[PDB]
Amino acid sequence: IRTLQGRVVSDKMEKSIVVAIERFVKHPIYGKFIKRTTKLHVHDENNECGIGDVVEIRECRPLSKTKSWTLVRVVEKA
């Protein structure tokens, strides 16, 4: 538990995807709600994700230079 839900935006790596988490945050000064994006490099053992899928991810130990997150489950296939 403690997961983020995102969207796959790359799958061109062996056993690893890029997921984009989208947040809706009030602007500090001007008060308008803005869209903000975090991109995480996630681990996916069974290359079971394609570009456009909605995935659910959890934080784990470091797996490589840039990966510290791992796939929990696919929520919606593309």
């Binding site: 602007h27 000064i29 001007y30 008060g31 308008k32 803005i34």
Partner: peptide, 10 residues
């Protein structure tokens, strides 16, 4: 507008 200030502040 708000959107213009978000893009380029005062």
């Amino acid at each position: 507008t708000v959107n213009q200030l978000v893009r380029k502040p005062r």
